[PDB]
Structures are given as structure tokens and as C-alpha cells.
Amino acid sequence: MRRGLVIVGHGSQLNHYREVMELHRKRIEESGAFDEVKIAFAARKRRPMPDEAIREMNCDIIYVVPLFISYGLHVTEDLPDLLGFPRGRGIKEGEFEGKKVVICEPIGEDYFVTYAILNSVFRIG
Template sequence: MFSKPDSALVIVGHGSTLNPDSSGPTWGHADAIAQLGAFGEVHCAFWKEEPSLRQVLHCVNKREIYVVPNFISEGYFTQTVIPRELGLDGPQTNVAGRTVKYCAPVGSHERMTDLLLKRAAAVAPGVSPKETSLFIVGHGTGLNDNSAVAAKREVERIRALGIFGEVIAAYMEEAPFIAKWDELSTQPNVVVVPFFIADGLHSYEDIPVLLGIASTSPGAASATGAGVFAQNPYRLRGRTLFYANSIGTEEGFAEVILDQVAAFDAAAA
């Protein structure tokens, strides 16, 4: 474990003006890293919450600042919004006398595969992977984001390991649609892992409705939605279905954040 007492870490999340749980995982990872004492300071910043990207650098005492996006994929936010709002012009930028080092987002780290496997095993204990169809569910729209690409990449990696009967990428808003999970899969057991950075409207409500394990309840984008994870397994459409929390709630994300800092240093060396 490296130690950077003279550096600050800023973890950037999306945040939400509607969902009180959206920023929770980002704060949790920050708390875990602060407890490790790996950095002199650890901060969070958000697009939709405060501290905002326009405020956070005023809160940092250190002159060297690593910024790690807590995002699933490279895309609009990591390539356009975060650099623009922080005033970055490349991997390393001098911003008002500070050196800001912009790292890759957590979701692009190869360790994501292990975290998905861990999450899938935890949600369906004792279930034979060979008799299981594993779904990695992304958003999949024209959001100028590469979340669908990231989900496909993880599916290919997990598929190559030969652990599961089948591994399938599916999406909320583009084909293959997660709503057709029973047509897309053949195994008796189905494990569904949302490939999102936080639990919220999508994991609490949208995907459960598409899966057929919950009915629409407008405005339920809150902790009350967490009940959907407590009712595993679901028996429907002739299968046994296990529904997991969003992958971003996995504790191992804190280590991935540190790995992305180490990767930045390695690339710069």
C-alpha cells in the first residue's frame, strides 16, 4: 500500500438531486481510504451535489491533488464535464498553483471483473455457476457514454473465465433489453448485477420493474427501494432469479480507486 501524506485525493461522483443514496458509495469509499491514511486529505466532489466540482479545489490544503472519477466508464462525464468544471487540460494540469493529476475512472480498471464475480457469488450463495446465467446490466442509451461498451467488455472477460453457464450483457434502454431476460438466457438460475456506480432509481425501481420482480411505484427512488434486494431469490418465468445491488456499492471499489492513482503514477514515471 502506497502512502501519499503530502497529496490529496478527490473522488468525483455524479450525485443526485433526487436520490439520497446516490452519493453514499462515493462517500463510503472516501471514508475507507481516509481510514487507511493513504493520503494527506481525502475529499469528494459531485456534479449534482455539493461539494461541487467548482468548489472542491478550494477545500484542499495540499498542492498535489489526484482526481479519480467514480464512474463506470470513460465517456461524457469523464472526458468533458469533469475536466471542464475542474479546469483541466490534460492528465496533469496546474490549477491556481496546484498540480491536479487526473486518473482513469474506476469502472475501466481490470479489477472490476473480480468485483463483479464477487458480487455475483455473494448474491447467490451455494448456487452452481455452471447452471447460472449471469447478466451484467448497463443503462445503454445515447447519453454519449460508454457504459454499454464497458458492460460488454466485462461480459467478455467473465465469459472467458468459463465459470458461468452463460454471461450476458443487457440494457435498460437498448437491445438486448433486460426486460427479455428469460428469452435471452437458458440456465435455471439467473443472477442480475446492475453495472451502476450507486443504487438509486435504476437499481431500486427501473430494473426490478423490467425484470418483473417489482411493480411501478413512481417516486420510490429512496431507501425504501432497497427492499427489492432482501427478497432473493425470486421464482418467476420458470427460473430462480437473484438480484444484486449495483456494483458500485462493493467495498472493493476503494482499492480500485487507489489502484487508479498508482496506475497514473506508473504511466507518468
């Protein structure tokens, strides 16, 4: 089973936003954790959109991770709508044009975000 990861962002006009997104893609690609890692973007005219990204991916299952702190309409409506998935909060399983796709929850409430905030002070590393 070839496993893909698409990292989906939005806050995308801010300086160095794509570059930080690409740093995570690079780190995760080098770790071997997934067969393929791509970055994509919600909303209007920033390429690729998550649907293009998934189409281009040569994986049997693709995991879609929203790099959002918030849990608003980009996540509960825009993104699912784009991929033809159910709206609302939470994990969603399904297929996008024949391929298995799982929309994961946004990273916002993850204990790792709490710890990233702590580490900005602690600087253990």
C-alpha cells in the same frame, strides 16, 4: 445447476459504454465462472432489456448485477418492475417466467470499486 449472469447498465449514451460492458462480459465468460454471460440495459429502447436477456438464457439460475455506482430508481424500481420483483434496496430472489433469478445489489458500494479507484493511481498490473 446451469448458472447465468446478466450485467445491467445505464449511462448508455456515453462513448465506449457498451464496449467496456462487453469487455467485462468477455473477461467473465473466458474465466468460466458462469455458464452464460449477457449484457442488458435499463430504461427505454436499448436492447436487450433485462427481461429479453433472461428469456434468451438457457440457465436454471440467473444472477442480475446492476452496473450502477448509484442506488436510485433504475435499481430500486425500474429493474424489479420489469422482472416482476419486489421494489426497494437489497438482494431479491424469485422466478421470472419459471426460471430462478436473483437480483443482486449494484456494484457501487463494493470495496472493489474503492480499490479500482486506488488502482487508477497505483496501476499495479
